[PDB]
Design a protein around this ligand. Structure first.
Ligand SMILES: [Zn+2]
Length: 42
């Protein structure tokens, strides 16, 4: 593994464990692991 390690994923999710090339990409993705709009009373 010359010139560092294979592949460069400076951004990786914690919920699923995905990896993106750009930050924004990961951010927009994280949205999937979020959905609190409706008034959850229970
Ligand atoms: Zn994820």
């Amino acid at each position: 593994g010359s010139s560092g390690s294979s592949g460069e994923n400076p951004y990786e999710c914690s919920e699923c464990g995905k990896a993106f090339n750009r930050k924004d990409q990961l951010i927009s993705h994280q949205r999937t692991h979020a959905g609190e709009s409706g008034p959850s009373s229970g």
